[PDB]
């Protein structure tokens with residue numbers, strides 16, 4: 001369970017992210033795809049992209065980065081009381097998109113890296129640890145839903 005202090009650190013940096021949702025979403029998905037190419041293969045929508053420049057030039061990829069970070073932001077602002085937001089996401093990601101929990105770990109790493117690059121003064125080690133805990137909570141709770149469903 002995150003403390004109130006930990007949530008403050010998470011949401012303080014997240015308020016910075018929200019000044020440029022789409023740029024962050026692009027950097028995070030690109031980092032995910034470059035670092036873990038099996039992830040790109042899960043997107044029929046993106047698997048034609050073969051270079052980082054092609055990824056950066058895709059408006060559809062940028063739109064999807066906004067979709068992703070908008071959903072994550074709504075979850076983080078619930079400070080753990082996020083059951084209603086996570087159910088539909090876990091259901092789609094387990095049963096329709098067929099995303100393993102491990103790939104959620106990979107996107108969490110990409111998020112943390114991009115936040116560190118873009119917001120170092122609001123993303124020192126205390127805030128990195130708190131965000132790690134927030135994303136771990138996200139993963140834990142999705143994984144319990146996956147287990148229920150047999151994924």
Ligand code: HEM
Pocket residue numbers: 038039040042043044045067068069071072088089092093097099103104107
């Ligand atoms: C922070 C983690 C993530 C969040 C918040 C997130 C959120 C979303 C949202 C809101 C959608 C659209 C609604 C829905 O289908 O549920 C979506 C679609 C999708 N997500 Fe994620 N997602 C995450 C991680 C991932 C990862 C790691 C993968 C793949 C490796 C993935 C693959 C997909 C796919 C394939 C779709 C459908 C895209 C399309 O063809 O339009 N998601 N995601």
